[PDB]
Homo-oligomer: A and B are copies of this chain.
């Protein structure tokens, strides 16, 4: 049924594997998923964010492996924004994965075939996602999902 398949990130269920093997669009939040969740503001009007290098490679593998990559506000940049893309790309909801970190992402993660919460996501989001990563946001959590998707699709 839905027992454990070993990965280098720890075991996953067959349910998760059957979910990830249908995925063709990966939707990613910025703050708390690709970034540490911090915005580095300065007195001189600066605003910085920190993104992880291992993530950008994970995104490139997925992109060249046939997984589109969208950054909810190169790749393609609430409830309705998700619907505009899936129609614009003609992708079915079962075929979408979503990585978020805040409770304000739940209405979209409720429609996607594979909802993902980063390890240090908002506590109220963790029981809702199909999968909770082992890596924190901005620390390679997106790479973790990217690797698991390619594994589930026999591409890695």
Q: B-contacting residues of A (Cβ < 8 Å)?
A: 8-9, 31-32, 35-54, 57, 101-102, 104, 122-124, 126-127, 138-140, 143, 147
In the docked arrangement, what's the CA distance between A25 and B50, Å?
A: 32
Q: In the complex, which residues of chain B have a beta carbon less than 8 angstroms from the beta carbon of A50?
A: 38-41
Q: In the complex, which residues of chain B have a beta carbon less than 8 angstroms from the beta carbon of A126?
A: 8
In-complex Cβ contact of A124 among B8, B40, B138 (8 A): B8
* Copies of this chain, whole number: 4
Q: Do the beta carbons of A42 and B47 come within 8 Å of each other?
A: yes
In the docked arrangement, what's the CA distance between A47 and B41, Å?
A: 9
Q: Do the beta carbons of A44 and B41 come within 8 Å of each other?
A: no
Given A104-B57, A123-B8, A124-B147, does the pair A43, B41 have CB atoms closer than 8 Å?
Answer: no
In-complex Cβ contact of A36 among B38, B46, B123 (8 A): B38
Given A41-B48, A43-B47, A49-B40, does the pair A102, B138 have CB atoms closer than 8 Å?
Answer: no
In-complex Cβ contact of A39 among B37, B53, B104 (8 A): B53
Q: In the complex, which residues of chain B have a beta carbon less than 8 angstroms from the beta carbon of A38?
A: 36, 50-53, 138
Distance of A148 from chain B, by nearest CB (Å)? 11
Given contacts A35-B53, A54-B101, 9 further A-B contacts (CB under 8 A): A8-B123, A31-B53, A38-B52, A40-B50, A41-B48, A42-B46, A46-B46, A46-B48, A48-B48
A-B pairs with beta carbons under 8 Å apart, 16 shown? A8-B123, A8-B124, A37-B53, A37-B139, A38-B50, A38-B138, A40-B48, A40-B49, A42-B46, A42-B49, A43-B47, A44-B46, A46-B46, A48-B48, A53-B102, A54-B122
